[PDB]
Scaffold this active site. Structure first.
Site, mmCIF file in Angstrom:
data_model
loop_
_atom_site.group_PDB
_atom_site.id
_atom_site.type_symbol
_atom_site.label_atom_id
_atom_site.label_comp_id
_atom_site.label_asym_id
_atom_site.label_seq_id
_atom_site.Cartn_x
_atom_site.Cartn_y
_atom_site.Cartn_z
ATOM 1 N N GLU A 4 -2.393 -0.042 -8.871
ATOM 2 C CA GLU A 4 -3.371 0.945 -8.430
ATOM 3 C C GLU A 4 -2.701 2.310 -8.362
ATOM 4 O O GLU A 4 -1.606 2.439 -7.804
ATOM 5 C CB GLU A 4 -3.956 0.583 -7.062
ATOM 6 C CG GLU A 4 -4.762 1.722 -6.425
ATOM 7 C CD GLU A 4 -5.585 1.289 -5.220
ATOM 8 O OE1 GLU A 4 -6.367 0.322 -5.335
ATOM 9 O OE2 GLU A 4 -5.455 1.925 -4.153
ATOM 10 N N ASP A 53 0.817 -1.206 0.000
ATOM 11 C CA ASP A 53 0.000 0.000 0.000
ATOM 12 C C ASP A 53 0.855 1.262 0.000
ATOM 13 O O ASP A 53 1.890 1.326 0.668
ATOM 14 C CB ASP A 53 -0.933 0.004 1.214
ATOM 15 C CG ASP A 53 -2.125 0.921 1.033
ATOM 16 O OD1 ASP A 53 -2.380 1.351 -0.112
ATOM 17 O OD2 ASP A 53 -2.810 1.214 2.037
HETATM 18 ZN ZN ZN Z 1 -4.878 4.854 2.299
#
Ligand code: ZN
Ligand code: ZN
Length: 500
Positions: A279, A173
């Protein structure tokens, strides 16, 4: 029966080892399962089968047993969950590997502790939604002493405990630089969330001379005016027009960030032989992502050949961690319709909601407009559920943790924009042990505890020993069933309101 194997193990190793029935898998001749020591909570892999299979696993042998199916005796070996043993296991059990999601709805369940993946698996039971069971930001891993290898290994160990055989993904992430991308590659992560937010400029905070120089250089190198000036897009019964100054503001806001994303994508193309997903997150912007900015970003990514699956926009309203959505539901519905329409025609591609933890007020409109092709990310909410269990069964631990977090909140609230009102967290010294759990229902306390997770985990006494992490994990191990059900029910609430 299970009790006969447990008696065999007790008689030979001299420990009370309880089998997780759902973890038992039979493949080749071999039988794999996981046991838990009743005394210290340590979990182990047990492999029963031919010598040629047990030899590939490290660990000590327990003895020989006779399989009901065949006269020949099978070797029993008990192994720790070290990395190479997990690799061997993941070769024998091929489902224990992350997959690319694709263009289908997904949901990320970050685990800042490393022990909640079985609960997350429970949450997806019956849901038609791709699960991202391994998901931690680079900064979270930094703050917790974990790395991509260990995060993915924790998630896969939990999946093995659960017995789940369906597909799952592993998202690294908010990645910024290429070395972290390299570590995630070598660990085998399947989704890469590129965060170019360092390069994003907010024109309302910079002078006009600087904005001008920035646009001049970016347009001298890319010729954005010839490409986009006056261009018109008909999407969703609406017209979008790149007038000069709108395009200029968009370019100064996002051009260097698009350059960063291109560089990261090319790095992944060069260094990753394995299937991967990308992403593009613009979830770190002070202003909601305008529709024209959406169009510009997507068209620039397509022109440069940057193949992405998810786009994480910054939506209207307040998206603070650990509480629900604060904003005009009217405008959120309308802008969500806008962005969903543009995503359909431009791609289609997934719209990704970061900071989805606990935004129940907004999930109806999300399921309305993107309910087919969404991704929703969560992480700290599972930590909050774990702390709730701690307050439910070890109130003296929660009390010290609450005070320590209240004192650390000022240094910890910098990296996040939270409007917490400290005067509205209840006074803990006026609250008995029997009621501390209620504190994790109060939004501002939820923010204080959500934010200071790393400090509580990393806190260390003068002698060098940690204040909370040892007792925190031992508490959570002693009440594993309650921890599991709370986390699972919370995540399943999230999945229910999203319509999957
Ligand atoms: Zn976030
Ligand atoms: Zn850069």
């Amino acid at each position: 029966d299970r009790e006969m194997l447990e008696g065999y193990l007790k008689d030979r190793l001299g420990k009370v080892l309880e089998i997780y029935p759902a973890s038992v898998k039979r493949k080749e001749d071999a039988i794999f399962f996981m046991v838990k020591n009743r005394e210290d909570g340590e979990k182990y892999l047990v492999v029963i089968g031919s010598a040629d299979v047990t030899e590939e696993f490290s660990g000590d042998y327990v003895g020989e047993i006779a399989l009901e199916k065949s006269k020949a005796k099978s070797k029993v070996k008990i192994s720790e969950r070290n990395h190479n043993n997990l690799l061997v296991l993941r070769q024998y059990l091929p489902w224990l590997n992350p997959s690319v999601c694709g263009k289908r709805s997904s949901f990320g369940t970050g685990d800042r502790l490393g022990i909640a993946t079985p609960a997350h698996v429970k949450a997806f039971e019956g849901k038609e939604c791709f699960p991202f069971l391994a998901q931690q930001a680079v900064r979270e891993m930094s703050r917790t002493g974990r790395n991509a290898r260990s995060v993915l290994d924790d998630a896969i160990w939990g999946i093995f405990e659960s017995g789940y055989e369906g597909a799952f993904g592993a998202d690294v992430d908010h990645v910024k630089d290429l070395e972290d991308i390299k570590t995630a590659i070598d660990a085998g992560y399947t989704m890469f969330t590129i965060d170019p937010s360092d390069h994003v400029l907010d024109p309302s905070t910079i002078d006009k001379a600087a904005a001008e120089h920035v646009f001049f250089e970016l347009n001298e190198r890319h010729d954005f005016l010839s490409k986009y000036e006056e261009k018109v897009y008909e999407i969703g019964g609406r017209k979008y027009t790149f007038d000069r100054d709108s395009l200029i503001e968009t370019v100064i806001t996002y051009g260097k960030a698009v350059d960063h994303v291109e560089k990261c994508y090319l790095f992944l193309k060069e260094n990753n032989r394995n299937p991967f997903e990308l992403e593009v997150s613009v979830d770190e912007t002070s202003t909601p992502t305008t529709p024209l900015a959406h169009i510009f970003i997507v068209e620039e990514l397509k022109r440069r050949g940057v193949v992405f699956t998810n786009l994480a926009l910054r939506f209207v309203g307040e998206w603070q961690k650990g509480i629900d959505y604060i904003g005009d539901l009217k405008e959120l519905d309308s802008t969500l319709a806008e962005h969903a329409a543009i995503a359909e025609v431009l791609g289609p591609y997934k719209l990704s909601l970061h900071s989805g933890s606990d935004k129940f007020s907004a999930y109806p409109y999300f399921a309305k407009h993107v309910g087919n092709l969404f991704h929703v990310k969560t992480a700290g909410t599972s930590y909050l559920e774990a702390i709730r269990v701690v307050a439910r069964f070890s109130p003296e631990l929660y009390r010290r943790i609450h005070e320590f977090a209240l004192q650390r909140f000022e240094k910890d609230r910098a990296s996040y924009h939270v409007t917490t009102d400290l005067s509205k967290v209840p006074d803990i010294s006026k609250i008995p042990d029997s009621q501390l759990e209620d504190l994790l229902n109060e939004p501002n306390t939820r923010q204080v505890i959500h934010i200071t997770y790393g400090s509580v985990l990393t806190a260390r006494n003068s002698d060098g020993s940690y204040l909370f992490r040892d007792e925190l994990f031992k508490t959570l191990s002693e009440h594993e069933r309650e921890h599991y059900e709370q986390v699972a029910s919370h995540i399943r609430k999230h999945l229910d309101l999203l319509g999957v």
